[PDB]
Structures are given as C-alpha cells and as structure tokens.
Amino acid sequence: MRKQEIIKTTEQLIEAVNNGDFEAYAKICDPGLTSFEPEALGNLVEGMDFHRFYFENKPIHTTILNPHVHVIGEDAACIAYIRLTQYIDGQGRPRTSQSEETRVWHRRDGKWQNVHFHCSGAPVA
Amino acid sequence: RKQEIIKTTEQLIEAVNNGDFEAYAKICDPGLTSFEPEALGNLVEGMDFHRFYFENPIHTTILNPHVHVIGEDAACIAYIRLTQYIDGQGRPRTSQSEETRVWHRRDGKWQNVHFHCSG
Amino acid sequence: MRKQEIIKTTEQLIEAVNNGDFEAYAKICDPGLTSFEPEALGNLVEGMDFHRFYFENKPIHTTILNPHVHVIGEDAACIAYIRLTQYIDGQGRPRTSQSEETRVWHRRDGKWQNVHFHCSGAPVA
Amino acid sequence: RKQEIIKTTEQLIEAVNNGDFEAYAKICDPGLTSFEPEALGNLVEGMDFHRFYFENPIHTTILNPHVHVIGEDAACIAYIRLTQYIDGQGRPRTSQSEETRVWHRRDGKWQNVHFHCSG
Amino acid sequence: MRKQEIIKTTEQLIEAVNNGDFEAYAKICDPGLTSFEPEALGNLVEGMDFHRFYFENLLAKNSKPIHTTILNPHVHVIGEDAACIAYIRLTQYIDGQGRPRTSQSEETRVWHRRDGKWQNVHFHCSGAPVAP
Amino acid sequence: RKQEIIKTTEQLIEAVNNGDFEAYAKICDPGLTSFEPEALGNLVEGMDFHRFYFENLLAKNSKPIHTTILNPHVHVIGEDAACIAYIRLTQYIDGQGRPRTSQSEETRVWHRRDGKWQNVHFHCSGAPVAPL
Amino acid sequence: MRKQEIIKTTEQLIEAVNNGDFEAYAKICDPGLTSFEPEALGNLVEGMDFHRFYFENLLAKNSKPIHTTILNPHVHVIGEDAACIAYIRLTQYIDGQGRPRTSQSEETRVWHRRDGKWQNVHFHCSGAPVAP
Amino acid sequence: RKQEIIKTTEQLIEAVNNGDFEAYAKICDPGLTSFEPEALGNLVEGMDFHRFYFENLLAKNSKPIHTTILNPHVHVIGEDAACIAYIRLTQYIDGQGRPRTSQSEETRVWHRRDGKWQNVHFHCSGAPVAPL
Amino acid sequence: RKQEIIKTTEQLIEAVNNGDFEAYAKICDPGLTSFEPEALGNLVEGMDFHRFYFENLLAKNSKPIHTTILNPHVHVIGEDAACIAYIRLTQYIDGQGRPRTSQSEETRVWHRRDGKWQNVHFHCSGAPVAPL
Amino acid sequence: MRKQEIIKTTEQLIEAVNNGDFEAYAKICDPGLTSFEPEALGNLVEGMDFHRFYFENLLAKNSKPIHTTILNPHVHVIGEDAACIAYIRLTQYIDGQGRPRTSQSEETRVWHRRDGKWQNVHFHCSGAPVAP
Amino acid sequence: RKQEIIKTTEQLIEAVNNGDFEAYAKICDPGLTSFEPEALGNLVEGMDFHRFYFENLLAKNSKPIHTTILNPHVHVIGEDAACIAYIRLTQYIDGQGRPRTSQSEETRVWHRRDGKWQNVHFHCSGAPVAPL
Amino acid sequence: MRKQEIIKTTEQLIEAVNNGDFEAYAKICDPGLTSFEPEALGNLVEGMDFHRFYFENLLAKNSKPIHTTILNPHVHVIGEDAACIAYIRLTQYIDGQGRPRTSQSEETRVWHRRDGKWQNVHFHCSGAPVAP
Amino acid sequence: RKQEIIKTTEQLIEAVNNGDFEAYAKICDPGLTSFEPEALGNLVEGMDFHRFYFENPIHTTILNPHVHVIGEDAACIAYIRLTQYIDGQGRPRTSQSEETRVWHRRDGKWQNVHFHCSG
Amino acid sequence: MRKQEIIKTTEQLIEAVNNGDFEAYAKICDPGLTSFEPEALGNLVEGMDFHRFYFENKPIHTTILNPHVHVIGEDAACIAYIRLTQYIDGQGRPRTSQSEETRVWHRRDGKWQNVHFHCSGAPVA
Amino acid sequence: MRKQEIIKTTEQLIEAVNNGDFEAYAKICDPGLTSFEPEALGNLVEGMDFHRFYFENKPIHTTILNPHVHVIGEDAACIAYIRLTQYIDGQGRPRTSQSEETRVWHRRDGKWQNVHFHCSGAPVA
Amino acid sequence: RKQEIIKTTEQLIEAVNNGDFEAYAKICDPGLTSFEPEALGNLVEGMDFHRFYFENPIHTTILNPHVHVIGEDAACIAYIRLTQYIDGQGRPRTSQSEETRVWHRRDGKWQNVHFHCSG
C-alpha cells in the first residue's frame, strides 16, 4: 500500500547513480548519511563527500529483486532488497553482479530522504 | 535517546552469545527480515532460521555506533561487531562484521524489524 | 489467495524428504514425475525409483524464501522458490546450502500432485 | 498436444539466437519469472532483465524433450539445451544447459510464464 | 510398441551386474559378445571371461547399496529379431566414506532375439565404469 | 557380406575428412541418434548438430589427415541390418607442423534402405576426430 | 566542543599532502616531528626532510584524482594547548589501469597549539601508505 | 621528567607479560582507545577487549619472555600529559623450543590523574606481542 | 592351425600368472631372446633373467589376476613355425583393494620341436604384466 | 651364415624409410603387413596405407640429415623361407635448433621369402618413433 | 662534539649519492677496512673496491634518491676519535617508476687527521645502498 | 704490538658467551653498550638486559659442544685507551640431529680501556646469530 | 678363444655378487685401473678401493658380449650388465651398466688389468 | 717408455675428431671398431658408419689428463685417460666438459689401430 | 725419487684424521698452519684449534689419486692430489665423496711439517 | 720477504684481467699444475689449458694474504679473490674465490709451479 512509494524513491536514487547525476542523488539522500559498503573497507562513511568521488570521476541496467519494506510511523521506512546490476566489461563480454542492500528512509517536507544505506557483495561504482 | 538503542542492541547480542532464544525472541519482531553471511545473499523471513543456531570462550565488542532516530518509536543503529574467540589450535582470533539493525518501539520494549550483517 | 495452498503442499513434500518418509513423498508426487537436479548429472530422471534410493539409504531445517506461484486454470500451479537448507557437517560445524527450485503442480482428486521438479545449486539428499 | 509446445519453444530459442526481442516479447508473458545462471541464484521479475542481452556462429539443439500437459491451456516442457559455438581461438565448443519452461495458452498463442536454466 | 521389451531385457542384464549373478548375465548375453568399455582401455573385448573377473572377485565386505536408472532410451528396431537401444546409465551408490555418489555412463547395446529370449551381441560404454 | 558394411563406413568417414556434407547426409539416416565426445554425454538427434562442424570448417584450418579403420567386427542381422564396431586411428598434422595420431572407439548401426546403406545410430569414445 | 578544531586542522594537513603543497604541510607540522609509517620500515623518522622526498618527486604525469575521508575520529584533549586524534584514513584514488581503488590506514596524530595555529609533534600510520 | 613516562610504560608492559590485569587496569584509563593488529584496523573502546587475552591465557602456554623498549621519544605537554613513541622488541621461546624476536612500533598517550599516570590511547604496528 | 598357437600362448601366460616356472621353462626355448619393459630396451638372453621374477614372487603379494588375449594375428610359416601378435589385457587388484587393468602389446615367435611348441623370441610393449 | 641376408634386407627397408622411397618399402613389405609401433597408440595396424601417410606428407623443408645404425642383431631362422630378426635402432638426426640427437628403438621384424626377395609380414617397435 | 661527526657522515653519504669520488676519497682514510653486503662477508682493504661503483655508475641509471640518518649514537674517544652507529633509510625510485625505501644498519669509526675527519672503518648490514 | 691485547680481550668476551657466564660478559662490556645484531631485527639495542635473556634462558639439555675461531682480525688503535677490531666469527657446533655445522658472522667491536681492563662500548654483527 | 674370456668375466662378476674377495683378488691384476660411477669420474689405482665394498636377492645378466682378442695373452670384452634386484618397497627393479674389461693371461689364469663401467 | 707412443697416437685420433678429418680417424681406428659412448644410449656401436654421421654433419681445445697405459705383449696397449674438452657455447660463454675414456690399441703393420673405445660423462660430438 | 716421501707423510696425516688421533696430526702439521677448506666457509683458518673441534667431537677408507709433488730446494714440497673418501651413511648405504687437496710441506729437524692445506669439493670431517 | 710474493701475484692476476698471455707465461712455470672450478675437479697439466681463455669492466681485489716463506727461493701465498664485475642486466656483482699459489724463484723472477682455486 504505502511500501510502493519506498520502492519508487529507491529506483530514482539507483538511477541517479547509474546516470551519474549527483544533484538528484544529493536531494534523495540525507546530508547526514551513514553507509556500510564494500568500497568503505568495513567502515561507516559519514558524508556525501565519499560518494561524490565516484560521480565526479558503460551500458548498465540495475534490477531490484525481492523487496521487503518495513513501514514505521507516518514518515519512516526500511527497504531490504537485492541489487542485480547487469553491465559489459572492458573485454566486451556481459557480466552480472549481486549485492544485498538495506536503505533506511525518513520523509522530510514531502520527499523521502535516505539516512542510512548498507551494501553486501559486489560494489556498483 | 540513542543511548537506549545501544543498550537494547547489547541485550540482543548477549542473548546470542549466551544462547538464550527466549530473550532474543522478545527483543526481535516475529516478522523479522535479515541479510547475513549464513543466508548466502538471501533475505531470511525470521525467527525459525535463527532458532537452528540456538537449539544446535568468546567476547563481542560494539565499536563506532551511529544511531539514526526517526519519530518517537523508530531507530537505525549502524555498528561494527569485533568478535574475539579462541581457535581449535588454542590461539586467540578476532573477526570483524558490519551490522545495521532497524528498531521499532512496541508497547514499551524495542523490537528489531530488520538486521543486516557484512563480513 | 489460491497461491497459499501451493506453498503449504510444497512444505509437506520438503518435510517428507527431511523426515525421510517416502509414503508421504510418493502421495504428493505424480508417479509419472520428471526432474532436473544436481544428483542427475544434467539428465531428466523419469521415476520415484531414482529418489527412493536416497530415502531407503542429522539435524537439518529447510527455509522457503521468495516464493512466486503462477496459477493456471483451476487445477494447475508453478511455484519458483529458493531452498536455504541449514544442517551440521560431520566435523560438527553448522553449514547453509542454497538451491533454486521450480515445482509444477496438478490438482488430482483433491490433493495437489507434483508432475515436474527443477533444482539448481547444491543437492539436498 | 505436446508437439505444439516443442514448436513454440524453438520459436522462442530462435528469437534469442537471432536477437529479435519483439518475437521473444510476444511468446513470453510480461509477468515472467526465471531462474538462470546470469541471475546469480535469484528469480528475475521479467523482460527488462533479458532486454539488456538483446539490445547489447552458433547452433542450438533441443534434446530429450518431456512435455507435461495440464488442462486445455497449460504445459510444462523439460528439455536439454546443447548450444554449439566457436571460441576466440577458432575451435568449436559445446555447452549443456538443463531448461524447464512453464507455458500458458492466452488468446490463441502460447505464453511463457516461468523459465528455469541450469548449467 | 516392440521397444518396451528391449528396455525390460536391458534392466534384467543391468540388475544381474548390480546383484552380481553371472548365470543371469551369461544367459542374456551372446557367448560371442564384443564390447567397448572404459575398463578395456580403448580395446574391443571378446565374449565373456573378461566380465567374469568383476563378478567373481566381488567381495561381500565391499558390497554397497546401489540403484541404476535408465534415462532417455532410444530403441532402433530392425526386422523381427534385432534391436539397438542407446540409453544413459545414472548409477547411484554410497562411497567407503559413507556419502552418496552418482556416476553417468552413455551405453549402446545391440540385441538379437534367439529361441525366444533377447541375446546381447555388442555393448558400448562411455563415461564412468559402473561395475562393482 | 560384412565387406560391404566396411566400404560404406569408409565413404562416410571420407565425407567428414573431405568436408562434403551432401555425401554424409545421403549415407546417414535423417533420424540419426549419436553418442560422441562433442555431445557432452548426451544423445544428439539430427544432422543439424553435425552440419555445424561441416559448414564452420575453414580452408585455412584444412590439414592433411588420413583415417585408418582397425580391427572391424560387423554383426549382420537379417537382409537389411548390420552393426560394425571398429577403432578410428586418425593421423593428422598439428598447427606447429608435427604429425599426431588420435584413437577413438566407434560403433555404427546400419540399415539398408532403397539400395544404399543408411546410418541410424553412431557411438564414439576417445578423441573427437572431425576436422575442427 | 574543542575537538572540532583538531579534526579541521587534520583535514588541512591531509589536503596539503593530496594537493602536494609542502609549505602548508611544513607550517601545520612541528619541525621536530617524529613519525611511525609503513614507508619508514618500522623506524621512527626525524623532523621533515623524509616527507619532502614524496612532495618534491611527485610528477604531474602520475598526478591522479584522489579524495581522503576521515572516519570515526576520537580526539583526546589534554590541557589548553594539547590534543590526540585517532582516526581512520579511507583514501579513494584511480589506478594506472583506470579502475577506482580504496585504501584503509589507521592514523594517530598528537597536536600542540603554538602561537595560535595547531602544530603536529607526532604521527602514527598503520595499513596502506597513502602519499602519492 | 620523560624518565617517569618510560618507567610507567615498563610497569604496564610487565603487567601484560606477567598477565596481571588489576595492574594493567590501574595504569590504563577506563575510557581507553587503541589501534592494534588484533583489532583488524579498528579503534577498540574499553579494557573489556584486552581482558579476553589476560583471562584466556593458560599456564600451559606460559613461555619465558622479555620485552625491551628501544629508542624512546617522550613528548611532554603541560604538567599532566605525555606522548611516548618507542619500539617493542619482545624476545620469547616458541613451542618447538627455539628463541624468537618480534618487533612492534608503539605510541602511548599518557595523562597524570590523582597521582599515577593513566594511559588514554595506545597505537601498535607490526607483531601482536601479548602472551596468547 | 592358428588355434593351436593361441592355446599354447595361454598355457605360457597361465604359467607366469600361476608362478609355475617348470611349465614356463618347457614351453620356452632355452635359447630365448626377448625385448620387454623390464629389460630397459635390451634383448635378454636366457630363462635366467625371467627365473628372478618367478622365484622372488612371495605368497603375501599373490593377487587375484586374469589375463585376456585380444585381437590375435597368427602368421603360420612352414609345418613347425608360427608368429602370434596379440594384446595382453591383464586384470588385477592393487594393494589398496581397487581393481586395475593394464594393456601390453606382445609378439611371440613359435617353433614346434619334438611335438610341443617352443617360444624362441618374445616382444612386449606397454606395461610389464608379471606378478611382481 | 643365412642370417647375413636377413640383416641386409632389413637395411634396404630402413634406407627406404630414411630416403622416403615408398615403392622400395612397398616391395620389401608384405601387402598383408601387421605392426605394433609407438605411432599406433598400442594398436596393431593393418597392411600399408597407415605408413604411406608418413612417406607422402614428408616435406623437403623438414628433410634432415639422418643415419640409422642396426646394433646387436639376433636372427632366428625357421625352415627355408622364414626368419625373425630382433635388433636395436639407433637413429642419429639433427633437430630444428641445429643440435645432433640420437633416439633408441627396439624392433622385431618377421620375414618370409616369396619368389626370391624377402617379404616383411610383421614389425614390432618399442621406444622412440623414428620415421621423419 | 657528536654533532660534527653526524655532519661529516652526511658529506660522505652525499658524495656516494652524488657519485663524486674525490670528495669520498678525502673523507675516507686510504687504509680503509669495511664489512658490507657487496663484500660477501669479507673485510675489503682500499678505496679501489669502492671506486668500481663510482666509475661504472652511468647517467642513464641515475635516479632521484634521498638518504636519511635515523637514531644516531656517537661514541667520542679522546680528542681525535669517534664511533657513530646509525640507520640508513635510503629513499629512491625504481625503473618501473614506483618509490621504494631500503634500510641498512651502519657503523663508521672516525679519526681526525690534520683538521678534517677521516673514516678508518665502515660496517653495513641490510641492503646495499650505493647508486648501482 | 698493542693490537694483540684487543684480540685477547675479544676472546674472553666470546668465551663468556660460549660458556654462558654473564658476570664475565657484564665486566668486559660497557653498561652503556650499543649493538646491531641479527637478533635485534635491524635495531640498535641498549645496554645489557637484551643479552641477559640468551644467557639466563640457556638450558643444560640444549647445551652443545661449540668452538669459536677469530679469523682475519684488523685492530684500528686510537689514542692510549681506544681500539676498533673488525674480525670474522667462524662458530663450529653440533646440531640436534648430531651432525657438525659451521656458521660465519662478520663482527665489529669498538673498545675503551677504563681503570685497567678493556670495556666494549659498541658491537656490530652480520650473518648468522651465534649465541646458544 | 673369446668363449674363455666370457667365462672368466662371469667368475669375477659372481665373486662380487657372492662377496668373495679372495676369488676377485685372484682374477684381478694387483695393478688394476678402473673408471666406475663410485669413483666420481676418477681412475682408481686398484684392490684397496674395491675391498671396502666387499668387507662392508640379486641376479646379474651379461648381454651382447664383444671380445677383441689381441696376440696369445690379451683380450678386451665389451658387454652390458643388466643387474636385477628388489627395492625396499618389495618391487623388482633392473639397472643397466655398460662395462669394458681388458684381460691379460699371466701364468695360466686370466688377469683383469683395466675395468670401465658406465650407467 | 713404450706408453709414450700410445699417448701420442691417442692425441692424433682426438685431433682428427676436433679438426673433423675422418680419413685420419679412419686410418687410426680399426674398421672392426666397438664403442660404448653417451651418444649410443648404452649400446655397443659396431662401425665407423656411426661416427661418420658426426664428421660429415667452433673453437675447442681438448686436454688429456692422468693417462694410465697398460702395455700387453709387443703389439697391444690399453690407455685409460680423462677428456677435459674446452669450447664456447652458442651464447658465447666458455664451457668445460669432463669425459672418462678407455681406448684399447693394437699395432698392425707399423701404425697403432683402435679396436675398442669407452666414453663416460659428456659427449664430445 | 724424493716425491715418494711426500706421498707417505700425506697418508700418515690423512690416517691421523680417519683414526681420530690428534697428537699424530699435531706432530705432522706446523703449529702456524693456514688452511682453505669447505668447513671454513671461504675463510683462511689460522690454528690447530679449528681442527681440534672435529677430533675431540664409522667405517671409512680414503684413496689418494693422481698425486703431483712439486719439490723445491732440500726442505720444501707441494703435493696436489684428489681425496676419494669411501664411507657408509646413517641409512646404511655406502657413499663416495671427491675433494681436491693441495698441501705445502716444509722439512723441519727430520720430519715433514704441513704449513698450508687447501681443500675443494666435499668436507671429510 | 712476503711483500715481494704479493706484488708478483698481482702482476699475474693483472695479466689475466688485461688478457696478456706473454706476461702470464713468464710469471708461470711451464710445468704448472692447477685445481680450478673450470677443470671440473681435475689437476690441469699447464699453460695450453689456460691459453684457450686468453686467445678466446672488472676489478679484482686481493684480501687477507698469508705468505708462508720456505728457504731462499720458495713461497706459498693463500689469499681471497673478490672479483667485481657488471652483469648483462647492467647491475654490479661480486664473486668470491679462495686461491693458493705455490711460488719458486728461478734465475731472478718468481715462477708459479702450482695454483688452487675454490668458489
């Protein structure tokens, strides 16, 4: 019912990363963002500044499989989905990479803000 | 308010290390989701999966906690799990694991709705 | 709605294998059963007789994750689920094994019969 | 009735080998599920996943088919996919894959609702 | 139609090997039997005697629960008293460690009906050698 | 008698070595079954599988080769049926320029249809001995 | 409260190394600087001169887009003009092949406030050596 | 001056070598941070982490060891603050019975509280040199 | 004719498998030449060379074995001379307890002297197939 | 006495192979020739055709100065028109690199005198295959 | 005092890094002894040994290098004698273009003769740190 | 002339280590002793205490017959009360297996005559570490 | 005359296999030279070297002898030594060695003046 | 005394091989020559014909060390010497090769003939 | 002529080492003895003291092959011989070891004294 | 007297490094014996063996000499040969060799009668 909005906002964020448009990513993310990801080497990154590097510095298509949104109150949600990223390597052969993601959401003045983001498996930068 | 979230997380961790499921079951939401290395990159649907490990010398340390409080009855702690143990050879070993636990306060006590584990 | 019956009948079959009760397995399966599984070495096995071997010849717990039942007509269904089998090895350490399963179902005189069964990943015999 | 299921399966396979998506899209059910080696042990939710491979010398052979017909408008074919191709070195190679396709006849033509692929 | 008899006679022969009863094997096989098999090291063995070794030297201590499955048969019937079955041999057994194992072998058996019963004149075997 | 079966087998083999499919297609039964190392332990149905190896054969990779048929054993059944079980010693020259030999154990089941002998089944152990 | 100044001064120093501006590094560091780092091979280097090498010998051809992140800081304030920050150095860069790489290094910097600005008296570094 | 800091460091080291935690606990600040090889590139918070190594030390594994503190460099700040940066040459005897030496680069930040010196932070590169 | 040569060859082979030299000595010509893998590419003169393998055979190492003579080709010359060229498929059981097959290509030149057939020369390629 | 003729005829055959003149080889060999040789992969090749390959596919670019030596001959004469020579083949040649190499091979040739000239009915070869 | 010994040691080191022998020859005693890794565990007598490394240094192999003298310990004896025991951290850039550090433990015995300090003995453990 | 006293005092020290008598070693060595040796892992150890470990932890069960030889000495005499000997240490011993072994080590010892007896202020050692 | 040289060579060989030096000493010339693998490519000066091996199940076979007779009291035999023995594992092994023995008939019996051994 | 003639005739033969003059080698050798050498692969070669190959198909210098001539009768000798052959490899570096030789000699109508020749170690062809 | 005395005195010394009688070795050797040997690790040992170790701390037989004595003056000689030492290893198998030796001799008050001793190849301690 | 022996040894060494045989031939005794690594553990009989190396950037250093003087016209020097050279790669290398040279003064100049070389 309300979980359908959380999945749509998650796609927008993912599309911002695949397209490489930071201004869209920055809007959907909470300036005070925490994140565990394989690129962080088992550390909790504090800023946008960490992610900006990957934006500022190939045909791909992300698929969001088996979503599970835990809705809390009026303005809080926790989606736990799988990230099947399809891309083409330098050699020219097509490759798929699986990554398990958890994104904690907080609705602030209308739009949904991303406060925390967990990522297991392959890095998608 | 974040200090309460860290205390409830320790209780849950202690329940796993002590092997007391009834304590784990209380602190966890019966409708629990979880990504963990044991799940082989799948989202387990709750309790019954964990029960297996309970029914069938260590010291856990919770480093660099970061609690994101949302509303009155919602929190998201993102901490590191440094588990110290002793191998079969007899030498002491440490294992690092990155954990995210999403919390929901229901009729007083804090319930764990989702749990992520890397490493 | 009707998919909930297919998931329950699948659990009964799985439980029959874990418990090692063939008579229950034989009832839920169609005597004319086809099956691709890792034990078959990429061949389509024809009988119960193949499975009987594993029954006639350890604490485990199977979990059925991300089910997807395709209902066709009144008496036909196709469930596509993941088999997370938790067990304890000979050394005494606990192990988990993932296997992707597809079971095609056919309702005959009340009870659901299993006509075909696909299994990718780890064998659970 | 099983002879129709084998013919429709060939059309789909030929659509993939020829790289004509419009033919693949017609024969497949928009709400398509699929276990395949490319999915990394996950159940893909349909079309968009496959489109990638289409948009971005071989001969396929369909060995030992086994069609389970259910009702008037339902079938389950379980066949082997012997795909013959030529490697970069120039030598010819064969690759075996075990496939299960669940079919549903909708307004005349057969639609593919589920597709399993091992090997 | 007539191919169903060829598959039944093939099972009897296979069961004779799994059970280790040579007299049954000897009856179903043609005394002038040719055979390519992995045990022969790429040679065509003559009639019987070669196989007897595997039957006779089978000890009860090494006797393991096994079950053979005959998958995707293809019987080519020629005349009234001749047939050629080409099947796959999925042999399920339990190793010395106690774990269950499966072994695939591709078999071709040429049959000749003599005074009622079917006689095996030639036998080809690729893959794993699946005599106990 | 058996001498006709060995001659027809050579024609088929020569069709593969020369890379002339039309000759291969004539001598083979359109409904052909076959176990061979290229099939990965499966029973192929059709010419279509074999056509690939004929058509994709380049003249640049065309090497001087000579097949030898050793220790034949033809089992004649009725008037229009035969089963030859022979060894295929294929002599060729590798890309480096050195001469190499490859052994393969073959069983071909034959059926005489409207004059000429047709190949209904074909088994092959050892090395895959097709120019490709 | 006062720890926020220590984290800001640490960033300035780090930025001086990433930008390759020694004059800024020299100002923020105490001329009598001690340092354990992976480049020192388990020795305590004396004040400056050792570091100058890495600044001066940095060529523009090898100049790579890099971005340092300071994670989980822990500032121990002592008196009015002394601090000890213990932080993790996640350095993001792009290798010669063109692929992006991250390198972790555990750092401890002991600070001493002299005539206004903070001076770095000691510097410890575990893990990867992350000077260009 | 600096001579007091080196003496207090020896007491702490001796507490670890002797395996007496109560002495270690006294000399260390309950709010202790620490980078060490056992922490896997993380900053540990507490005694609790260290207690494990003291308590789980068996008398059967108790080996004759002798620590040497080489090239100390004490940075004194104010009246009640110091930063020693020394090398830890730990001499021990392995299970085989042969004598072995292990080098580790250490930085310990000290704070004098109600008389005795308290250890607030502790850095360790190289070998983990705790009896276990 | 050639059937007598194959029977006498079996007697000789059986004498080696049974380890009865007196039978071997009778069937062999005292002036026997032989190329075999045990000779290291030399032509041995005498029984004396072979006697070693018979006499030094222990009962503890005595294994169930069965030799098979495949694709014989006897070249008869005059009344009292023959040349058999056969393959020796020796089936045995290794120390581990598993069954093994070993191929060896043999040529034996025969000479009929005062009734019984005498072996004047013996060639052996492949595996040395004597119980030892 | 009569053995000297057998050694001379063997040299002629060997020289025919080294010179690459098949017509001379074909004359000295019996059209119904059997042969065990390393090139045959432990099989008994039929008469001619197999050998022709090595003669015909010999290129002038790969033509190397070679010299065969026949050491320790042992001719077993049977009747008037039958002989069995067992000799060693030391073939001296020069490799592609330009260095001289020697290769040993143990040979047995069974001879039959037909209308004057000696015909070779069987030929065994162990060790190195020494056809250009 | 000891500060003069460290300055004269730098001059000598700089003479080796710059490749100016005349400066090295002046600062060294013509009757110089030396243990170094290049000597293969022997005590070299003369400049002549060292001259080789100076003279055979090519400008093509000339790399940007910087030596650092860490933890000096000068033992002054009388008016005209000193013994410095220091560590040689030599920073350089390899042929691949990556920066490398090499540690070497050095002992230099000094003797003040007609004003300037002369080097009578020189010990070197670890890496040989001469541009060559 | 005066160098003969330096070689005798060096032997006394060496004999103190081989005999395992520390009190004799302690007398001949300067309490403020520096030393580079292979056991120190490229560090300069402080005075005594480091060495005591090797003396005290020497067990009688591991006590092996050893004999040190001082080859090619070179004593540099400075003033009245200073000397620098540079010698090779050929230590002969017997391993646990019982076989005799020799170990080479290049040593430099700087000497200072204090109230009669010669005191050792510095000691360098390359090659094998030759303390029991 | 060559048949006598082969018989005397067997006696010498048998003396070594049996380990009877007095027989070896008689058949050998006190001034004996010898190249053998034990000598490490040096020419041993006689008896005393061999005595060591005597003082501190096999069957030797002498294949392809070639005796060069010179004058009345001189011969040069060049033969192959196929020595059959049993290894520690219990399996039978053969070892080839190429030998040249130069003979000199002195007061009746044949004396061995030189002995070469390859392999 | 008489052994000095045997060493001189051995040098002539060796020089014939190093110079590659067969006619000189053929004269000094007995047409019925036996020989064990490393090139023969542990066989006794019968002819000149074997050696001719090496003649018909680089700066070297042979040295004859520790000769030991056993003189028998008037026309028989047995020299046992070491062959230190110095040569330069294809790379251009100088190499030495040791070979232990025994040559049995027979004086026929004046000149010494070589009836047998043994060679251990390295081949000098 | 005079070289025969040098070979006899060399045997006495060798026998003293094989028998393990130092007093005999000490007499035949010059107290001021130099020596290059494999045990010295490419150094020139100065004393008896080095050798004493091996004496103070198995059936063997030494053979002295191809001696070459260079006689200088009335009381000086230089023998250059090969040391073929035959022994039995711990396993029980017989082994031979070659070593090239040079011993410089000086006749002092009757008996020959050994002033220098070189040894290449295998050590015989 | 030992200082003359060391000077004559340098002249000989320099003759080898410079490749001037006439100088080497003068300083060496025509009846020269020599153990060296090139001889493969054999005693070479003089000149002709060495000539090969002469007819078909380095710096030699003579360390720790020890001259044993015997009579008026005899000496035995035992020294170490540290030869410095540059490999094909271009890096500098050192090679150690232990040498013993026995000297005999004949009509003025010192002649080399024997020469040992290890390493």
Q: What single string gives the DSSP state of each residue in chain G?
A: --HHHHHHHHHHHHHHHHHT-HHHHHHHEEEEEEEE-GGGTS-EE-SSSTTHHHHHT--STT----EEEEES--EEE-SSS-EEEEEEEEEEEE-TTS-EEEEEEEEEEEEEE-SSSEEEEEEEEEES----
Write down the number of H helices and E strands in chain N: 3, 7
* O70 contacts in chain P (CB < 8 Å): 33, 102, 104, 113-114
Distance CA I63, CA I129 (A): 12
| CA atoms of L30 and M53, how far apart (whole Å) | 59
Please list, residue by residue across F45-54, b when 16 or more beta carbons sit within 10 angstroms of its beta carbon and e when fewer do. Answer: bbbebbebbb
SS3 J48: coil
CA distance O61 to L129: 36
Query: Å from M22 to nearest chain I CA?
Result: 26
Q: Which of residues 28-67 of G touch H (CB under 8 A)?
A: 34, 36, 38, 42, 44
Taking contacts as CB-CB distances below 8 angstroms, the residues of chain F near D94 are 38-40
CA distance C76 to C2: 11
Q: Are O105 and O98 in contact (CB under 8 A)?
A: no
Nearest to G43 among K70, K91, K97 (CB): K70
A 10 A CB-CB count for H8 gives 19
Q: What tokens appear for F68 in the block?
A: 């030898």
Bridge partners of E125, per DSSP, are E107
Report how far residue A78's alpha carbon sits from residue A3's, in angstroms, rounded to the nearest whole number.
9
Query: What distance lies between CA K40 and its chain's CA centroid?
Result: 17
For residue O125, the chain L residues in CB contact (below 8 A) are 100
Which residues, listed in sequence order, are joined to residue J90 by a DSSP beta bridge? J69, J104
Q: In terms of C-beta density within 10 A (0-12 exposed, 13-18 middle, 19 or more buried), how is residue O76 classed?
A: buried
Interface of D with C in 96-115 (CB under 8 A): 96, 98, 100, 102, 104, 113-114
Q: Which of F43, F10, F27 is nearest to F115 (CA)?
A: F27
Amino acid H115 reads G
Going by beta carbons, is chain A in contact with chain D, meaning 3 or more pairs sit under 8 Å apart?
yes
- Cα C76–Cα C77–Cα C81 angle in degrees, nearest 5: 160
Q: Which residues contact B40 (CB under 8 A, 6 or more apart)?
A: C84, C96, C97, C98, D41
Of all residues in chain K, the one with the smallest CA distance to P98 is K42
End-to-end Cα, chain F, rounded Å: 34
Count of H helices and E strands in chain D? 3, 7
Helix (H) or strand (E) run with residue F21 in it: helix F21-27
User: Rounded distance, CA K91 to CA K100, Å?
Assistant: 6
Using CB atoms, list chains with 3+ pairs below 8 Å to chain B: A, C, D, H
Per DSSP, L43 falls in state -
CA-nearest of K132, K7, K1, K131 to K69 is K7
SS3 category, D44: strand
CA distance D98 to C116: 13
Residues of J in contact with I85 (CB under 8 A): 34, 36, 44, 122, 124
Contact P30, P50 (CB under 8 A): no
Q: Cα Rg for chain A, rounded, in angstroms? A: 14
P3: alpha, beta or left, given left = phi > 0 and alpha = psi -120 to 50? Answer: alpha
Mapped onto helix, strand or coil, the DSSP state of residue F60 is coil
The method of structure determination was: X-ray
Q: How many CB atoms lie within 10 A of CB I114?
A: 5
Dihedral-angle region of residue G2 (phi above 0 means left; psi in -120 to 50 means alpha; beta otherwise):
alpha
Contact C43 E67 (CB under 8 A): no
| Chain K touching partners, 3 or more CB pairs below 8 A | G, L, P
The beta-strand segments (E) located in M19-109 are: 28-35, 43-44, 59-63, 67-69, 75-86, 92-105
| Nearest CB partner across the interface for L42, out of K33, K83, K126 | K126
Nearest to H101 among L39, L46, L62 (CB): L39
Candidate from C59, C84, C88 with C-beta closest to B40 = C84
**Helix ranges, C20-64 (H):** 22-28, 49-56
Dihedral of alpha carbons E33, E36, E39, E45, sign: positive
Count CA atoms closer than 13 A to G37's CA, side-chain side: 20
The Cβ of residue H114 has, within 10 Å, a number of other Cβ atoms equal to 5
DSSP state of P37: G
- Residue P15: which H helix or E strand, with range? helix P2-18
Task: Give the three-state DSSP class for A25.
Answer: helix
Chains near H (3 or more Cβ pairs under 8 Å)? B, G, L
Pairwise CA distance, residues O15 & O105, whole Å: 17
Residues of chain O contacting residue M87, judged by C-beta atoms under 8 Å apart: none
P and A adjacent (3 or more CB pairs under 8 angstroms): no
Q: Which residues pair with G58 in a beta bridge?
A: none
Given the structure tokens 């070189």, which residue do they identify? O118
Provide φ and ψ at F99, rounded to 5°: -80, 140
